[PDB]
Amino acid sequence: SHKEFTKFCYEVYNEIKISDKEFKEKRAALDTLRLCLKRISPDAELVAFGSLESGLALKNSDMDLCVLMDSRVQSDTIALQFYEELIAEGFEGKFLQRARIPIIKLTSDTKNGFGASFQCDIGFNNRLAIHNTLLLSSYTKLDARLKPMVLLVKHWAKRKQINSPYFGTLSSYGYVLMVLYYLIHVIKPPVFPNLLLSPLKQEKIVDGFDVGFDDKLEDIPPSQNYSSLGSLLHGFFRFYAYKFEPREKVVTFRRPDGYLTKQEKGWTRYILAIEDPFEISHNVGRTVSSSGLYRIRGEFMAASRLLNSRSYPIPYDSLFEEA
Ligand SMILES: Nc1ccn([C@@H]2O[C@H](COP(=O)(O)OP(=O)(O)OP(=O)(O)O)[C@@H](O)[C@H]2O)c(=O)n1
Ligand SMILES: [Mg+2]
Numbered sequence: 578s579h580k581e582f583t584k585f586c587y588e589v590y591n592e593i594k595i596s597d598k599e600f601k602e603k604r605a606a607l608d609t610l611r612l613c614l615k616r617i618s619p620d621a622e623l624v625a626f627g628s629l630e631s632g633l634a635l636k637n638s639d640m641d642l643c644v645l646m647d648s649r650v651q652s653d654t655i656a657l658q659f660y661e662e663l664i665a666e667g668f669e670g671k672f673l674q675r676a677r678i679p680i681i682k683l684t685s686d687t688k689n690g691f692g693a694s695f696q697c698d699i700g701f702n703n704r705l706a707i708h709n710t711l712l713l714s715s716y717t718k719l720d721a722r723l724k725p726m727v728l729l730v731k732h733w734a735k736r737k738q739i740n741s742p743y744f745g746t747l748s749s750y751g752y753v754l755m756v757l758y759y760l761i762h763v764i765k766p767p768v769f770p771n772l773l774l775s776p777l778k779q780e781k782i783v784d785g786f787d788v789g790f791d792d793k794l795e796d797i798p799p800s801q802n803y804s805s806l807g808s809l810l811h812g813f814f815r816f817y818a819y820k821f822e823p824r825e826k827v828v829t830f831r832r833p834d835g836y837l838t839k840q841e842k843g844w845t846r847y848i849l850a851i852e853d854p855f856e857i858s859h860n861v862g863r864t865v866s867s868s869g870l871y872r873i874r875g876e877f878m879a880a881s882r883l884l885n886s887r888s889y890p891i892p893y894d895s896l897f898e899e900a
Pocket of ligand 1: 635731749
């Protein structure tokens with residue numbers, strides 16, 4: 578059935594999704610940040626990416642931003658100038674640089690009214706992340722079930738302590754890709770086509786990678802999968818609990834049948850292997866340790882068992898209880 582579980586899923590979704598109120602405050606914050614950038618470099622553009630842009634944001638979301646500028650202009654000089662303007666304007670945070678890549682990490686706002694724990698990461702010419710976000714935004718527009726499904730999975734992973742890339746588990750973006758892989762290449766009939774492998778896809782090279790995909794969404798036929806949100810979630814938990822083979826296989830968006838071995842990739846960390854759809858050299862699961870994968874799989878299994886339980890009433894709330 579999944580009727581009661583679906584009802585429960587939509588109720589949780591409405592409580593965890595970013596409110597219209599917080600969203601418009603994040604937009605106001607972006608406008609302020611843009612004004613500060615204007616004063617420093619009139620040619621540069623400040624753009625948002627990640628879950629606020631794709632519509633996949635939970636409450637109390639962080640902001641992910643990228644400064645776009647002339648590639649002939651070295652990013653560190655403008656980065657520092659931007660950072661110093663932000664301090665003068667009452668933001669708090671850090672200026673840092675890993676290798677050649679400068680980053681600003683804002684952690685507070687003391688004047689502009691966006692909060693004592695206003696969090697905002699600023700990159701410089703991170704064009705790949707913009708493209709990744711365009712892909713996720715396109716899928717989110719293609720089927721209305723994706724948004725609530727992703728938010729629920731993200732909320733679950735947080736509650737189960739398996740959403741900690743610094744402590745041996747998986748990033749939120751990694752969970753999003755696991756969702757999409759399931760909806761494109763596992764479920765039958767598929768919820769989504771693979772937009773990268775479309776015969777209408779046009780090559781577009783950005784920083785050496787092909788970020789092309791079919792984005793003419795209005796011409797794409799609606800899904801022939803009629804499953805409820807509840808049923809989609811249960812199949813998702815089941816696939817990664819019992820069917821997916823993390824020791825051998827790679828989550829991939831580059832194969833018509835979604836089949837790819839770690840050996841073909843030379844990805845023999847590679848404990849969990851998730852090939853970023855555009856930056857194919859990047860394993861999104863590289864943060865996942867052996868013990869971390871054990872807990873991830875354990876939680877997939879526990880979720881599957883809960884939804885398959887014949888002991889009624891099923892305590893659906895325990896899906897989002899802290900492990
Ligand atoms: N390996 C990664 C991870 C991050 N990003 C980009 O950075 C964004 C933010 O990543 P993440 O922190 O994992 O998502 P959040 O929305 O910030 O997490 P949450 O919604 O749970 O708060 C992603 O959408 C993605 O575009 C990326 O390009 N490649
Ligand atoms: Mg984000």
